[PDB]
Symmetry: D4
């Protein structure tokens, strides 16, 4: 919970809102969390086309300059780091616990957009998407929860009953929104993502 | 529950509904509840620009003239009192119990608008907003429940399992409404609010 | 459950759908249930301006001619009876059990409109409306459940966990509909209604 | 012919139960009408329904006049009225009916928006015609549609052609609603049948 | 779960989307599952007017040519088979367990449209539709669950707590969709359907 | 050319299962059509689909006539009909086709609104044209759009220019719907291709 | 009279609590206004409400000018302004008012869309007139409606007739909204009453 | 100038993750454009974004031509294209630009609706003008709005005045959408600035 940081970046809108005007851009909010090895997880869709991403811890007002290590394209995950060491001082990385089951309560921790306070959201795993290799083995690919993740929270951690992390959280964009539906990327995807980065 | 009073005031609409007509105004309903020390809590947004606010207890038809002690601007809380002593006769102030947790059942008691009957609404704490001081300490700032608070109920008390009060209740105004989403101001905010009043 | 009958009547629409055309009318469906003393409960809003209301039991295709004893105006309740004795043969009236509490599961049994099959709907008591006399005593006035009652079901019985009746059920008309919100008239209202009839 | 247009007041009781345990909600409504030849006033049937008494108001004063309901249509939404007070009729030229309108004719609709005492004048053009046919090949105008939304209180007011002559009674579409820009007018042949069926 | 297959067919739209253009058609997705006796269950509405339906198992990319045995008209059920024996090799048909009760958790397994991954959806039986013969006996006719079945999933199996099948699943088409409402055809209907086929 | 416009009756069975355990809902529908040269009637393809028999009604009488389906379009929503009864054709002048219309042309659409036997006449103007091109640079009118909503029952009726000559078949937009004020017309070249492809 | 049209800047604080535990949200808003005779500027009352100071901008430069609030209407949404800086008034011809407009008159509305500094010019026609009546039979224009949507920032800007003379102040409909194509204009008599009531 | 209007093909990858664990969805899109002087084609910037290659199609044939992206606007949604194939340009007269349009001018928009190869021609009138101002009092046309909805595939196509001369590039409103009947056109001055900034 002290590992949950707020992400600041500049969001350039995808569309011309009027054909005779430059694309509207403005500063946006997002969430992330500290994992082991001086790394911060967050979503990709908030650090794309970035010029500079700045982080912020809970009690402090001090912003820090993050360094984009990798930006996923197969999944909405970004891997960051910070050069300053004052950032990593006195903060405990999250721990990754057991994969949740259907109807399991999850908790999503993030910073709602336009503020510095932390929001904690309760949700239950209402749907799972499951990968299936030709080997015969199946890994967990997607989680859906029955609670809406408000805008700024996207990219924060999702915890199980035991305060252990079970993935990254995402506001439901497609279809209709704010209708009590959220998404979560399970740990195996996060693993593969880091694996593909470290190895290559 | 016998501490829950109905609030009568005059609500002047925020907008001209037609640019050539005076702002539409009419009498409105709201809810509140008796706390210790001859004080009544309710929301601010029902007593702003007031000329006179009148209260009413459950079984009686008698209205009483309330006296606005303070109107919050940092939070939607108003502090009232009544000079008549017949008001405070034979009524027990609510008791403030333990802060609720996620998924905790809460109960919201208020008077629905346009009637004298009491409505009791069941809801569960679906989200929490948490303050964080530079000291390192965190206090509870906001509660969201998974049940809609209908109009007149706003300002009434919210109780935990043990019939103990855990805050003031509010109809969700912003975003979409009546979609099973309500707000509750936790006790620490109410405390700070009274503290800022008494001390100053 | 064998006490739950289907109600047939002619519904004349409230509005001219075109100002130059007679009011549109057509046959409608509704639900009711057998209580003690050769009486059938149902809603008022399906037997208003009636010419003739016809009932029907579960397994039989035979319709029976009902006789409107009373039509409520303070509450949406109608009291019927049937002169034929073949109707009351081999059918057990419902039994009225304890008043439900918040979050109590209820079951609503009725005939969905346009068919002869029975629908059974699960819902939980999500809200209560409470009367308060000047004496100091409070009786239960209204129940709201977190499940939608589809059209034809209105007027059927609502049961508690123990298969005992706890009131009459109603499709939510006002505000928005089919958004998982139903109403139920508690037993004390049904009692008062019958009392006001028998005594007068 | 501004002076012939009057505001209709009647107590409207809703067709539905707002809640199954309460009386049908009931409140004062507003509507329009107009003075014709022979001490008569035309307005809509729907506003004067029930056996509530109806009041009339004229353009200049706030004086209300008690009206007598002569006939309430059922084949069409027209009601015929009169007023005993001789001062009601004094110094008012009744409307004069004109030629049947054709497609694309410009019309003008005069009435009192609900809630206010001021007169409204809405432009519109005949967008659709409904036409009745007889067993010998004769044709009669049954309905008119205009490409203008008629606001609630205006129903019952007159519709005029370019030459200021009345050409039917104006009505709002009850479904659809509202800014679909559709409006209905009952043409004179129907009004004539209504009155002939009254007199005979 | 290894018995759950993906269904490929060509869906010809029901309407001309423009009156001067041929009806729009395109390839669609659907779900089904293997039962005993070299048979595959699925919905009818995906194999109507078919030219050829092709199946696919979980880990394999190999498609197989299915053979439409029967297409229901009383219920949305299709009965398929495959001539290839490599299809039925090493796959265990589902087992049919006890009929669920109200509030019973069910699980729906299917392939979401436009992908090969398996989706697993949690839902609870929120409503039952019950048949009633003149004999006096009642069989279960319909199940409704409080979770939406996304498009491609329709036709897959629904399981109870014990991983035993309790019917075929269906996306809610009528009324509003994706509002957390799904349908399931209970086992007795599936039985009757197969009975009517085998016997005739 | 009012006399040439006829009302089409056909039993319409819906394309979807209303509930997966019931027969597809099925009910009588209404539509429009019109008499042309050579003992033929034009109407839409969608109303006469399935092998249901279709009846026709004329403007004056309530007599229905059994129709014969000669050809049902697939490249366009047109059907060609005829009637054996000689009395159907007696004393009716068929429609006469006119010049290709241009953008901003005023058109008139004649038909029978669903549910009634009276004739409707809707104004409209050509707002958009869809144009086909050939491998040599030739152009042909493919579709017309008008800025008027065509109500359901009117589909199949004729569209006329200022000079009263037919200029295509009228259709309602199935999506969008409804008061978007958009309407479709199939122009004469397409009708001509449909008939030439019939005869040849 | 482009040069007389100015952009109004004011800090707008919302009428509602976004969340009950936060300050009412507050942000800079934009609006329009225009220069009239006698060192005065007309704009709307709603933008300049609260005791926030208001700035003005002219067509060519980005220079803002501090404005003085002379009078804020309550019977109508009009505010009268002035600016001390003499350079504000230099080289600007104030608007000239013209004849009362009639139904179907073409009007033109000039203003600054919110968020930008460029001038917008919207076409429209008078679709409805609201008319006031006196106790002696006199009539005065009270309100105008146009069949064009006025975008947010344009409220307060001028409305012109065919001859370029001002004919009222333009306003957007706050409910309905937005592409209902409805717009409001306060006609000159009301403006005149506002100013006479100011001076006197 | 039908022959100058071409259909643009480009592979469009969406700006959002459909699901956080999948690649951003990606599919072939369609758009319009037109041939101008000097071996150039104008179309919109948004369709040709990313470094996907773009193909062009002409009115008569289904032949596609590989296009070269010369310049993609950022201050406006315009892209400048060319094609190496000499046969693309053969026998095609480029569009000719005409006078700046005024309010209420009739315009015509030519383009290819998405999904099809046929040409669409939409009527419309200039409903609003956005006007830029310079630090000395000069004015330039910045944007045009028309009272016609431009369907998706038409964006990039030309807009013509009564005299058939081009008068800007047509665009659909991305929000609002769709039958609000609003359409955008970038007028020639902006196109001219785009090209001058290209050449220089």
């Amino acid at each position: 919970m002290d590992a949950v940081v707020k992400v600041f970046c500049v969001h350039t809108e995808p569309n011309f809102s009027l054909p005779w005007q430059r694309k509207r851009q403005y500063s946006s909010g997002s969430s992330g969390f500290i994992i082991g090895g001086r790394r911060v997880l967050t979503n990709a869709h908030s650090v794309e086309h970035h010029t500079q991403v700045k982080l912020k811890k809970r009690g402090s007002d001090t912003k820090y300059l993050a360094t984009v290590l990798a930006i996923g394209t197969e999944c909405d995950i970004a891997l960051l780091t910070v050069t300053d060491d004052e950032f990593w001082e006195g903060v405990s990385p999250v721990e990754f616990g057991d994969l949740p089951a259907l109807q399991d309560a999850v908790t999503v921790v993030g910073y709602p957009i336009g503020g510095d306070t932390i929001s904690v959201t309760s949700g239950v795993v209402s749907r799972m998407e499951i990968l299936s290799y030709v080997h015969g083995s199946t890994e967990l690919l997607g989680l859906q929860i029955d609670a809406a993740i408000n805008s700024g929270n996207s990219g924060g951690p999702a915890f199980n009953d035991k305060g252990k992390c079970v993935g990254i959280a995402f506001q439901s964009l497609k279809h209709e929104d704010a209708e009590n539906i959220g998404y979560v990327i399970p740990t195996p995807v996060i693993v593969h993502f880091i694996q593909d980065y470290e190895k290559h």
